[PDB]
Design an enzyme around this catalytic site. Structure first.
Site, mmCIF file in Angstrom:
data_model
loop_
_atom_site.group_PDB
_atom_site.id
_atom_site.type_symbol
_atom_site.label_atom_id
_atom_site.label_comp_id
_atom_site.label_asym_id
_atom_site.label_seq_id
_atom_site.Cartn_x
_atom_site.Cartn_y
_atom_site.Cartn_z
ATOM 1 N N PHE A 80 0.844 -1.184 0.000
ATOM 2 C CA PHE A 80 0.000 0.000 0.000
ATOM 3 C C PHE A 80 0.892 1.251 0.000
ATOM 4 O O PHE A 80 0.636 2.199 -0.737
ATOM 5 C CB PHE A 80 -0.928 -0.054 1.218
ATOM 6 C CG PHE A 80 -2.210 0.731 1.072
ATOM 7 C CD1 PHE A 80 -3.371 0.290 1.699
ATOM 8 C CD2 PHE A 80 -2.259 1.902 0.329
ATOM 9 C CE1 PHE A 80 -4.559 1.000 1.598
ATOM 10 C CE2 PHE A 80 -3.445 2.618 0.220
ATOM 11 C CZ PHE A 80 -4.597 2.165 0.861
ATOM 12 N N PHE A 81 1.958 1.248 0.804
ATOM 13 C CA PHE A 81 2.898 2.382 0.782
ATOM 14 C C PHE A 81 3.546 2.556 -0.592
ATOM 15 O O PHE A 81 3.680 3.677 -1.092
ATOM 16 C CB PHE A 81 3.982 2.224 1.837
ATOM 17 C CG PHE A 81 3.521 2.544 3.247
ATOM 18 C CD1 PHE A 81 3.231 1.524 4.155
ATOM 19 C CD2 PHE A 81 3.389 3.864 3.664
ATOM 20 C CE1 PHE A 81 2.828 1.815 5.467
ATOM 21 C CE2 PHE A 81 2.983 4.167 4.974
ATOM 22 C CZ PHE A 81 2.699 3.139 5.872
ATOM 23 N N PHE A 183 -7.023 7.262 3.236
ATOM 24 C CA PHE A 183 -6.338 6.630 4.350
ATOM 25 C C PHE A 183 -6.806 5.182 4.518
ATOM 26 O O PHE A 183 -6.190 4.410 5.246
ATOM 27 C CB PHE A 183 -6.571 7.423 5.648
ATOM 28 C CG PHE A 183 -5.659 7.023 6.773
ATOM 29 C CD1 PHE A 183 -4.353 7.453 6.798
ATOM 30 C CD2 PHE A 183 -6.120 6.217 7.810
ATOM 31 C CE1 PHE A 183 -3.503 7.094 7.840
ATOM 32 C CE2 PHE A 183 -5.286 5.851 8.850
ATOM 33 C CZ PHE A 183 -3.973 6.295 8.872
ATOM 34 N N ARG A 323 10.268 7.117 6.364
ATOM 35 C CA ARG A 323 9.385 7.662 5.336
ATOM 36 C C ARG A 323 9.225 9.190 5.456
ATOM 37 O O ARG A 323 9.072 9.894 4.453
ATOM 38 C CB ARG A 323 8.020 6.952 5.363
ATOM 39 C CG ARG A 323 7.030 7.434 4.314
ATOM 40 C CD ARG A 323 5.753 6.552 4.264
ATOM 41 N NE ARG A 323 4.827 7.013 3.228
ATOM 42 C CZ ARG A 323 4.912 6.685 1.947
ATOM 43 N NH1 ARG A 323 5.868 5.863 1.525
ATOM 44 N NH2 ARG A 323 4.029 7.164 1.080
#
Ligand code: BTM
Ligand code: MG
Ligand code: MG
Ligand code: MG
Length: 340
Positions: A80-81, A183, A323
């Protein structure tokens, strides 16, 4: 020390961190998976993967998950990231055709992941693998709900593509609504169920206290992300952030916006504490002496416990993960771990 502007003493004192015992193995297995699926270059996996703390985040959240379930969730999360990174790069490089095609492929793969396990786009194949595995824990009705929820997520990412391309910054309320989708609030909420080993009946998971507790847990995590990722996002011309909407449409300065986002995040915690009592009372009430009541009770209790864990895991992740370390990058607009 957490930067004063991001520090939340109530989280630090009242939301003690937890870590799943499978974490050490999870860290290695997800890293290996990223490599095998070719989701990130070998040299970038070696330098950055562990430092990104994607497994840590999930291992501090889904406490009590069977290891197999935790593995699938972490792989999907790391995917997903990377998708968030691909989406960003597509926008930055103006690759509208590539984005539209990926969008259509994800919708298709979501409905039939087995068929896409070896797709030419490794991002699609990675997606298919994690979703096939996620689909193997609970009945098809849960799988269908996960898909329905993720179809909505994909389309919100599409809406983001067009906002950024067209230079539009959503209004505050437009944003807040969109943010529940970008989100993936309801995906993480869905995943509570395989993590506690039970698909909850609509009448249980739609109980007002369960619903509100589930929402507030996600609003906290998403808005806290907005607060912590704001500097990285401004530097990369991301326009999706509660703070950016406030600056753009409420004429707030950066300082004022940070302050307002903080306030809204803080209110989330204390609203959660209140409804948490109602959700735990509900869990107690489900335990009515029957085998089924005990099962449902324990699953609700575990899920609500994990709604609580999201607070501390998401909080600490933003300070530990590479990140968000934009101060450490030579080009603040281009994170080193992304494929540019
Ligand atoms: C791209 C980031 N993410 C998770 C993959 C997309 C929903 C939101 C997130 C950021 C930080 C912590 C938790 C979730
Ligand atoms: Mg992003
Ligand atoms: Mg995003
Ligand atoms: Mg962000």
């Amino acid at each position: 020390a957490v930067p004063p502007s991001l520090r939340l003493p109530v989280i630090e004192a009242a939301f003690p961190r937890q870590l799943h015992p499978y974490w050490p193995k999870l860290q290695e297995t997800t890293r290996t998976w990223l490599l095998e699926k070719r989701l990130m270059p070998a040299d970038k996996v070696e330098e950055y993967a562990d430092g990104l703390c994607y497994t840590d985040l999930m291992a501090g959240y889904y406490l009590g998950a069977p290891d197999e379930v935790l593995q699938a969730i972490a792989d999907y999360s790391a995917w997903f990231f990377v998708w968030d990174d691909r989406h960003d790069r597509d926008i930055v490089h103006g690759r509208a055709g590539a984005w539209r095609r990926l969008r259509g492929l994800l919708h298709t793969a979501l409905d039939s992941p087995g068929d896409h396990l070896h797709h030419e786009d490794t991002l699609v194949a990675g997606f298919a693998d994690s979703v096939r595995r996620l689909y193997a824990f609970l009945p098809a009705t849960w799988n269908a709900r996960f898909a329905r929820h993720f179809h909505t997520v994909i389309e919100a990412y599409d809406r983001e593509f067009h906002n950024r391309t067209r230079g539009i910054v959503p209004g505050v309320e437009e944003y807040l609504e969109l943010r529940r989708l970008t989100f993936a609030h309801w995906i993480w909420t869905d995943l509570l169920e395989p993590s506690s080993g039970c698909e909850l009946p609509d009448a249980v998971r739609k109980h007002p206290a369960y619903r509100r507790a589930a929402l507030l847990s996600q609003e906290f995590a998403a808005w806290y992300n907005d607060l912590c990722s704001l500097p990285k996002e401004i530097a990369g011309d991301e326009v999706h952030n509660l703070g950016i909407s406030l600056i753009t449409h409420h004429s707030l300065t950066l300082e004022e916006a940070i302050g307002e986002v903080r306030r809204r995040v803080e209110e989330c915690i204390t609203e959660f504490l209140a409804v948490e009592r109602d959700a735990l009372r509900f869990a107690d009430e489900l335990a009515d002496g029957t085998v089924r009541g005990k099962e449902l009770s324990g699953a609700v209790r575990a899920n609500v416990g994990n709604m609580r864990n999201w607070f501390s895991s998401a909080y600490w992740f933003h300070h530990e993960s590479g990140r968000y370390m934009v101060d450490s990058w030579d080009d603040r607009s281009t994170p080193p771990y992304v494929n540019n």
